[PDB]
Design an enzyme around this catalytic site. Structure first.
Site, PDB file in Angstrom:
ATOM      1  N   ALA A   1       0.445  -1.141   0.351  1.00  9.90           N
ATOM      2  CA  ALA A   1      -0.252  -0.069   0.095  1.00  9.90           C
ATOM      3  C   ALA A   1       0.916   0.985  -0.113  1.00  9.90           C
ATOM      4  O   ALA A   1       2.300   0.970   0.235  1.00  9.90           O
ATOM      5  CB  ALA A   1      -1.454  -0.141   1.092  1.00  9.90           C
ATOM      6  N   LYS A   2       0.384   2.160  -0.316  1.00  9.00           N
ATOM      7  CA  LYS A   2       1.298   3.952  -0.643  1.00  9.00           C
ATOM      8  C   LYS A   2      -0.256   4.516   0.323  1.00  9.00           C
ATOM      9  O   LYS A   2      -1.742   4.950  -1.137  1.00  9.00           O
ATOM     10  CB  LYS A   2       1.943   4.266  -1.377  1.00  9.00           C
ATOM     11  CG  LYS A   2       2.388   5.209  -1.386  1.00  9.00           C
ATOM     12  CD  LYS A   2       3.510   5.484  -0.264  1.00  9.00           C
ATOM     13  CE  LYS A   2       4.605   4.411  -0.360  1.00  9.00           C
ATOM     14  NZ  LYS A   2       6.033   4.641  -0.470  1.00  9.00           N
TER      15      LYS A   2
END
Ligand SMILES: NC(=O)c1ccc[n+]([C@@H]2O[C@H](COP(=O)([O-])OP(=O)(O)OC[C@H]3O[C@@H](n4cnc5c(N)ncnc54)[C@H](O)[C@@H]3O)[C@@H](O)[C@H]2O)c1
Ligand SMILES: NC(=O)c1ccc[n+]([C@@H]2O[C@H](COP(=O)([O-])OP(=O)(O)OC[C@H]3O[C@@H](n4cnc5c(N)ncnc54)[C@H](O)[C@@H]3O)[C@@H](O)[C@H]2O)c1
Ligand SMILES: NC(=O)c1ccc[n+]([C@@H]2O[C@H](COP(=O)([O-])OP(=O)(O)OC[C@H]3O[C@@H](n4cnc5c(N)ncnc54)[C@H](O)[C@@H]3O)[C@@H](O)[C@H]2O)c1
Ligand SMILES: NC(=O)c1ccc[n+]([C@@H]2O[C@H](COP(=O)([O-])OP(=O)(O)OC[C@H]3O[C@@H](n4cnc5c(N)ncnc54)[C@H](O)[C@@H]3O)[C@@H](O)[C@H]2O)c1
Ligand SMILES: O=C(O)c1cccc(C(=O)O)n1
Ligand code: NA
Ligand code: NA
Ligand code: NA
Ligand code: NA
Ligand code: NA
Ligand code: NA
Lengths: 410, 405, 410, 412
Positions: free
Chosen positions: A100-101
């Site tokens: 994720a980011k």
């Protein structure tokens, strides 16, 4: 270029694995993309409005994991590619996460510390239902730090109870792990050790040239020095230093903390940092910028081993040139994974309710890095490919296997 | 287009910082929706939901199964629902979602699986008091039944989570007629201000579908003379009034309009420019442009279709003398009855159709009264009275909730 | 008292640290105070109504922790001081808890075992949403025991699933830890070993006088004896025994298990118990009552070290006097912490789903007690203070740091 | 003054004896279900910290979700909040709405806090009690020092933790699901209750002169409703001053003056008077609309009114009751006369739960209906037990709570 390099590696590895086209299409689509309004009062009461966001790429192997960036320039292609790359990277070292980011499109230089706190807490209020110890674990990134994570922890815990493991990179006082400073550079050395054993060699038989001397380069140089390695050259942004008999890295380190530039350190000769990459040495460790090896200098590299600690230091032009010359390149996705591996250990320790001492953190880091190398090596044999593809095929295949085993019926 | 919001923003003198917040959606969501096809091969689609504002209540809005997805159009439509719910004072904000797919490519078993996987991926983001979806292009009441069934596995039996349901699963009575009958309630209220009634007037109606049939029917029953009705195939004209009961009867028999002997066939291009007191566009938008606006015999245009009236005509009309009841209010009977469905569901007890239409009349009448008052305050036409009213209620609700964490 | 001692130590420690007065104000306000009606049918059907309560003082460092007292005399000022003390104590030994204290204003002697069960269960029904494995973890206290904890566990788990970590002090069969009976007395000896290591000394051949011979004193004496220490005097409420060559503690415990009297033991000479605190020895360990060392005997103490195992055995006058005599005092808040430390371990074992063997509990107890001494000692150098203030300033500062990192914006 | 809990417990004891309540049942009904004190610490606008203690006392829930307001006032303390919470339990039973009793507050002076500080304090207090309140659990509302804006902040913060929950709090702004009629409800209920009492004498509000202590949500709307029914309001006080006119104060002009930030003492349509002389003013009817315990053994003998209508909660203590009774003064008790507010709160909650609002005619029609039924029940109870109005209402409500408690039972 995060997108460029990640897409090149994904597509090469997919062809080697012969991934089914429709499975591949699914793996490239993020699980979930979120954008939320983040409006706060400034210290003087006037309103500021930002957009917070989180790209949650994949969770077949476990909760998502990744940084929160407070930065004004948001490129959605880059955010998307780095979340995807974290999915592959976590799989390479076999830690139980996907990628994720996230971040907030703001400039923290224009915000007071109280405004940054309110902004962090509001962002946490808007995404608390989408993250969680077993869902998505944020970490620091550009523009955020351990104080940011403490504020996420504190606000998140109002909604779901005391939950230390919801973020990594916390202050020690709130469940941060020991050994996090050294994790990446020490991990580079662990990886290098496993590589050299394939040749019945050790660190002590080798000379090393290190480009960059910050968090990664200092600890790598230290861990090399303590294991008998001769560090014959070191560069950073402002100069470079050379010694064919090995530099006293403890003395160099103490010269640094005393605010002394590399070039005017007594235990070595000043050299042109533009010559470090083509320096005579067995082992070259890029620990500064990406894109430093290319068609223009690849033919002049003298090392037989390149340990990719920085992100994407080798262009494809240079990759191919270097392989033909017989140069062995340990890829970044693996070699710099010490930091992310120890952040996993932080989460484990929090879940366990019981912290580890530093010796245990580093014994588990060594175990994880060594096992990942052995798995990469076995994949190179399987697919008769180089280390970079051994790693990406390993990570991609694990995500595909987990995805296929979970299945698709409703 | 942001024109209407921008006009109303400046009448109200909205603070710049507040305005900026009101334009940023509360939450935008995209999710992977991968299903096995009937043959077991995979297909992956992207589902999405734009949740614009919830200052005044749960969000509300349609789910579109359609391949062309333009994020700016979806965002504009979610925002317009926020203003529109505020215009008729129903306690919701605006949202819009969909799946980028072509449903004609999919079997019914595939469409059901896709609907259920979509619900699985968003169930935590919607809810009776969070966001209430509805049918839209490419979806229908069967789509809503599948969402209800799947959502109820996660949160318990929850009929109010979607509107537009089948009657057997909690759909409201009065839904067919709601929009067209709401159009006639709105105009009854309009004409009251000038001391006239439906019976006092002649009507030309562009379109004869769900809206046109019910609007013409309800006009006919209130004594109005419907002298011209358009549709796609043909058109019919009778200057002392068409027998709508018989004109409908003749449609039930797959009968075309030209073939209707109770009037003389006319050229459908000659409806907007037919002689009458009241013109009600009920089929397409962008039918009243700059050139053809001058050829308009009516003094009242009741905007039933969406944006039937180009902005060129807005300037002209006023000069020509025309009063324009704007679409954002005039066609809101449908969304209003969807609120009533939700109310009936959370009350556990359905209404009879008389009660639905009583409450529909009450809501449309009060909204017109609230709009007229605003027009006097700001001294604007009916379109800006409505938009200022909806924007101001959302702004007020937002300011009262406040900004501290 | 126990209220005035805590206040006096908090006050002195806050001034050494220079705590901001607004921060101090917050720290002495409890997070939450709860009073609940607890009404049950007696065995004969008739009603009885009691008030149950829980003071939850602080959770900056983790879930709250503390005992449940069934006792009629409730003093809110005492309950509050004891919850605060637990907040400081858990911080002194770096256990990830804050403090709490609760109870029911009843007399358990008036109640049948079935009445006590119903009361415990109703109390749990009234507070279950306010406690929890990561929120507030109760323990036995005066008037309650492991059976009481089993009833809390059983009823709580009806609302939240099997939740062994929701209380400590449980029966072994329901997740209680091994090693709890020896924990405090053994912890006293581990603490003593860490102290003497700072002088290059071990317990062997040193001489000890021990006041009190109950749970703490017997296990302390045994652990000392097994390490070669010479226990040259022991007293309890009924008598006292002495032997300058060291008492055979194994034999003495065998005698006491046969209900024998200290003064009657054959391996020593009877002594007057009033002469214990002033006995000639290297080490004095008060393990009985508080306030036993005051201005009118402090000058006649002959030990060089005092290991405080009882609560506040040394008043501030004696503190003063003994410091000026060169006497080193290991403070109670640290030295008797083995019991609270092992109750943490019980919670850990429950969270981890896997109970430890006793060797492991004792290895971790030694590690926690040693690390805490090392942190105290370092704190004494930082603030130029004695061990007692080194411990209180250590615990208070950890709570303050955690509070400040968490922050104040909503 | 007398301790508010000692005073209220004395009234409880007297009503229990009239009913002949079992001693063990009485002891249980006295003890509150749950008492909660929480730390509420906020940054001020300049960034410095201030710490308050907040309270929510949940007295009894046998008859439904608990119900009562939140007070921001410097005298808020555990005794005051316990007294108020118990009175809520009896009052909800008097009017027979399906609630139990609770009350909360914070010891603070809202005058000393900016509007953004009051919002932060309110939000933090909600963060500290959100797990204790709920649509079907405990439903707050505004009391002294709070208003509909305060409730909007509670709604907003609470809904972050549990989703959008309009019925978690009453007294909301109309824009956020408040009820038409709620702001005016306590004053209008005071007037409905007073008309019912005066009718027993053949008399009307227009036959009387009135003195009013307090000119906030209760006093303003009570004065307005009395004025509109021809009552002569001859004196009004608040914390800062007081105004008098023996010919009757033009209350419409006084409220416009108040709206313009005017002070009572400066109103041109009357004479400034010492607020300390309001309660002993020569009037037919005295309506306390401010703090409790203000009629005590020290001033009761000097009251000149022949009726006291308790709009405030517990304005008259038991010593004053006895003195006033011997003076022939009739006191319409708080637990009936001021119940219009919580009664319309119930309607607001109903409307929210039903997702569909009522018009103001319906709200006020149901309020009068509930107040009419309760007065007739009180009258019957006074006859049955040959007691005063206070005990007629108290025993009515206490008996209903006891019955519900006995139905629900005692096994675990
Ligand atoms: N992907 C991962 O998880 C991961 C983890 C840690 C670090 N990294 C990579 O490691 C590299 C360094 O990270 P870091 O934490 O040590 O950074 P840092 O900021 O601590 O240190 C960077 C060092 O590089 C030097 N430098 C910068 N530009 C240079 C140039 N042109 N020539 C020579 N020296 C130069 C700086 O002076 C400094 O010595 C980056 O590529 C970073 O992205 C990757
Ligand atoms: N905003 C809202 O909530 C809302 C609600 C309902 C309907 N509407 C609007 O109402 C309009 C009609 O909706 P409907 O339910 O009646 O549609 P429908 O599909 O049931 O019927 C539309 C009818 O338009 C007529 N028509 C179509 N093409 C025509 C042409 N070229 N010339 C003349 N007549 C033509 C035909 O009679 C056709 O049956 C649309 O503009 C729609 O967007 C708005
Ligand atoms: N704060 C903590 O976490 C903690 C933990 C355990 C014990 N303690 C302290 O240690 C003390 C002893 O604990 P314990 O569990 O061994 O108690 P215990 O009841 O098991 O034994 C008490 C002993 O003291 C003796 N004694 C009592 N009065 C005496 C007197 N006047 N003179 C001499 N001997 C006397 C008794 O005979 C007995 O031998 C406790 O009372 C408490 O002060 C503190
Ligand atoms: N608000 C409601 O719906 C409601 C319902 C029932 C009962 N009550 C009771 O009514 C009373 C007043 O509540 P409110 O809502 O009107 O409060 P408020 O804060 O709106 O106003 C209180 C008024 O009392 C005045 N006041 C305060 N201290 C005073 C003093 N010493 N002398 C004279 N005036 C003084 C203030 O200046 C103000 O005019 C309280 O006892 C409250 O519990 C309120
Ligand atoms: O609506 C309510 O719950 C309420 C609010 C303020 C006071 C009272 C009361 O004292 O009855 N009740
Ligand atoms: Na995917
Ligand atoms: Na400020
Ligand atoms: Na917005
Ligand atoms: Na505190
Ligand atoms: Na029995
Ligand atoms: Na009770």
């Amino acid at each position: 270029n995060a997108l460029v390099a990640t897409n090149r590696n994904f597509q090469r590895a997919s062809r080697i694995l012969g991934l089914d086209s429709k499975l591949e299409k699914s793996l490239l689509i993020p699980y979930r993309e979120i954008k939320v309004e983040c409006t706060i009062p400034k210290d003087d009461g006037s309103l500021v409005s930002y957009v917070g966001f989180r790209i949650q790429h994949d969770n077949a192997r476990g909760p998502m994991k990744g940084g929160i960036r407070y930065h004004p320039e948001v490129d959605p292609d880059e955010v998307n590619a780095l979340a995807q790359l974290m999915t592959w990277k976590t799989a390479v070292v076999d830690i139980p996460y996907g990628g994720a980011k996230g971040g907030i499109g703001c400039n923290p230089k224009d915000l007071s510390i109280s405004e940054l706190e309110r902004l962090t807490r509001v962002f946490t209020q808007k995404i608390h239902d989408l993250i969680g110890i077993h869902r998505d674990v944020p970490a620091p990134d550009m523009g955020t730090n351990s104080q940011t994570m403490a504020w996420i922890l504190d606000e998140y815990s109002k909604f779901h109870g005391h939950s230390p493991a919801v973020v990594t990179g916390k202050p020690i006082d709130l469940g941060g792990s020991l050994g996090r400073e050294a994790a990446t550079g020490l991990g580079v050395v662990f990886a290098t050790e496993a590589l050299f054993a394939e040749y019945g060699k050790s660190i002590s038989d080798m000379t090393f040239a290190i480009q960059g001397f910050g968090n990664v380069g200092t600890w790598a140089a230290k861990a090399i020095f303590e294991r008998g390695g001769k560090v014959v050259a070191v560069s950073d942004i402002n100069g470079a230093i050379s010694n064919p008999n090995g530099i006293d890295i403890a003395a160099l380190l103490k010269h640094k903390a005393g605010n002394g530039s590399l070039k005017d350190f007594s235990g070595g000769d000043a050299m042109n940092p533009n010559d470090l990459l083509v320096h005579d040495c067995d082992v070259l460790i890029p620990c500064a910028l990406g894109g430093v090896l290319n068609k223009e200098n690849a033919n002049d590299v003298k090392a037989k081993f390149i340990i990719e600690a920085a992100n994407h230091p080798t262009d494809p032009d240079a990759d191919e040139i270097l392989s033909k010359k017989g140069v062995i390149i340990l890829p970044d996705v693996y070699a710099n994974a010490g930091g992310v591996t120890v952040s996993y250990f932080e989460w484990v320790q929090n879940i366990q309710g019981f912290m580890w001492d530093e010796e245990k953190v580093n014994q588990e880091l060594k175990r994880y890095m060594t096992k990942a190398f052995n798995d990469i090596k076995a994949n190179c044999k399987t697919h008769n490919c180089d280390l970079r593809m051994g790693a990406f095929t390993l990570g991609l295949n694990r995500v595909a296997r987990a995805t296929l085993l979970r299945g698709w019926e409703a």
